[PDB]
Design a protein around this ligand. Structure first.
Ligand SMILES: [Zn+2]
Ligand SMILES: [Zn+2]
Ligand SMILES: [Zn+2]
Lengths: 89, 46, 65, 114, 263
């Protein structure tokens, strides 16, 4: 109830819960754009969870993998769910 | 002319803000790809 | 996926012959063995390069966008 | 990921010198030169040349590990003949020889038709 | 007219069969290795990608571009980027080409190495020029575009050598042989009944005298005369590989002489 999650570049604010992984490669919509090269634990996706203000939920590039974003996809599942699938190559 | 998204069927350089769920113009395909990147990538020819 | 440019083992440029090759076959109705030799592909390393190639880029193209 | 840069095979790094000459201890009038950024091309070639000099008592080379583009060359000479000089001679010879070869080949090439 | 001497059997834009005599197996061998890996050549070593709607990935395309042979006769005067004082590259240590291709027709648009466009000042020296030995003149097929697919690229070619990457290879494949008859005995043939009947014969045999039934083994004979044939990818003239190759190996040994000097 009145509690959702968002896809935007998180920025501390009372919680601070974030990790080493850079967020600089993140666009304001929390998704890297295809052409961009990634590595280490760079943040592929940025996500938020205002638990009963801003605890960082977000997927970092798996520690020992390093390629280039190939394509990003933004859809929805039955329950108007904002769906995301990032493909690194 | 700047965009942020693209449909996988009509390839219309869409892009919209919040409260627009997911859709294209006439192409109600709820998919959308994230265009490309402007900073261009450099490649090792090796 | 496209004719390798250059044969793995020695590097004889083998990227400029796909088409020539596929032509010496179709219209000139030659056996693969004779076609190859005429494209100047004498060593088997170079031969296996063209003979064995599968031009998938052709079915890759067939998808609309 | 744990692979060195290809250019490390031929380009000398920092503080490295093409040659390092340490005096051999086991035998007298013997030396061990260390060639950096050089493989068998130069290695096996010079041991060959060095072995025409009847004042060269011992001459061989080895690349202790294929990961490192480098090799050692040991040279023993008769008393009164500096091994360094032994190396200088072989090198000259290796050149004069390639001098003639480059010349003769171009010549021959100029008589060819096609 | 001195030590190493040559006898050429065949010659052309791509091949040169010759006989090297009055040379140690060593030199014959090094000279060979040098050709295969230590002769400067120009090759695309950097690729910037503007647009790629092709069905191939960027690094895939890029790998092929680096593979496309390019003129390299005047490389001996182009510089190694790593030695040029510029910030990155310039007309003094590179050659920039551009490849723009767009799927126009609906008949499948082919992209060739002849669509490469040199945009830097070649400063009047013959270098950087997609090499082409095709019948229809399309030096290597780079990629294929469908209906309306794009491909915008800028390539920077640099002076390189095989050792760094096989692409800087201008030698294709060398034919080597010596002692066509096993006179020297550097090999113990594997037979099943008759070695001499099971193992074919080399055309080099024809150029040397058989062994004669009852002659004792010539323990003093060494390896003289080598029957080679140097192929050439084009980037450099056949006759050139041999020469420059001899040059390089020559300069190498030279550097050791200088080294002992500075020492
Ligand atoms: Zn649409
Ligand atoms: Zn081959
Ligand atoms: Zn420069």
């Amino acid at each position: 109830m009145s509690i959702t999650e968002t896809f935007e570049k998180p920025q501390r604010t009372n919680t601070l819960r974030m990790k080493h992984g850079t967020y600089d490669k993140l666009d304001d919509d929390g998704l890297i754009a295809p052409g961009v090269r990634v590595s280490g634990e760079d943040v592929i996706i940025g996500k938020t969870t205002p638990i009963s203000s801003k605890r960082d939920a977000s997927t970092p590039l798996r520690s020992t993998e390093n390629g280039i974003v190939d394509q990003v996809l933004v859809t929805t599942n039955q329950d108007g769910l904002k769906f995301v699938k990032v493909r690194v190559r | 002319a700047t965009l942020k998204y693209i449909c996988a069927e009509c390839s219309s350089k869409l892009s919209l803000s919040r409260t627009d769920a997911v859709r294209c113009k006439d192409c109600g395909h709820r998919i959308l790809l994230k265009a490309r990147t402007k900073r261009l990538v450099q490649f090792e020819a090796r | 996926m496209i004719v390798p440019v250059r044969c793995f083992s020695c590097g004889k440029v083998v990227g400029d012959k796909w088409e020539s090759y596929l032509n010496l076959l179709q219209e000139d109705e030659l056996d693969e063995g004779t076609a190859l030799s005429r494209l100047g592909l004498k060593r088997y390393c170079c031969r296996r390069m063209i003979l064995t190639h599968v031009d998938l880029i052709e079915k890759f193209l067939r998808y609309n966008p | 990921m744990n692979a060195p840069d290809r250019f490390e095979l031929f380009l000398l790094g920092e503080g490295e010198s093409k040659l390092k000459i340490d005096p051999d201890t086991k035998a007298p009038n013997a030396v061990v030169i260390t060639f950096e950024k050089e493989d068998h091309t130069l290695g096996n070639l010079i041991r060959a040349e060095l072995l025409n000099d009847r004042k060269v008592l011992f001459a061989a080379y080895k690349v202790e590990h294929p990961f490192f583009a480098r090799f050692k060359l040991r040279i023993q000479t008769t008393e009164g003949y500096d091994p360094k000089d032994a190396l200088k001679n072989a090198c000259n010879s290796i050149i004069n020889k390639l001098g003639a070869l480059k010349t003769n080949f171009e010549t021959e090439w100029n008589l060819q038709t096609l | 007219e001195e030590g190493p001497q040559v006898k050429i059997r065949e010659a052309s834009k791509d091949n040169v069969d010759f006989i090297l005599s009055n040379v140690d197996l060593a030199m014959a061998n090094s000279l060979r290795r040098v050709m295969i890996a230590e002769i400067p050549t120009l090759a695309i070593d950097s690729v910037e990608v503007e647009t790629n709607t092709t069905v191939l990935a960027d690094e895939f395309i890029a790998h092929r571009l680096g593979l496309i042979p390019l003129q390299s006769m005047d490389i001996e005067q182009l510089e190694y980027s790593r030695d040029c004082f510029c910030e990155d590259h310039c007309d003094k240590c590179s050659v920039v080409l551009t490849l723009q291709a767009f799927g126009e027709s609906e008949s499948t648009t082919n992209v060739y190495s002849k669509d490469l466009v040199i945009v830097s000042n070649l400063m009047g020296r013959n270098i950087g020029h997609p090499i082409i030995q095709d019948k229809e003149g399309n030096g290597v097929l780079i990629c294929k575009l469908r209906k309306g697919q794009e491909l915008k690229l800028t390539c920077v070619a640099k002076k390189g050598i095989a050792k760094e990457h096989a692409k800087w290879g201008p030698a294709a494949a060398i034919e080597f042989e010596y002692d066509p008859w096993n006179k020297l005995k550097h090999t113990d043939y594997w037979y099943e009944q008759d070695s001499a009947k099971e193992w074919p014969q080399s055309k080099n045999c024809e150029y040397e005298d058989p062994p004669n039934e009852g002659d004792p083994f010539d323990y003093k004979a060494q390896a003289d005369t080598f029957y080679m044939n140097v192929e050439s990818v084009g980037s450099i003239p056949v006759d050139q590989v041999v020469v420059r190759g001899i040059d390089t190996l020559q300069k190498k040994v030279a550097s050791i002489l200088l080294a002992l000097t500075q020492m």
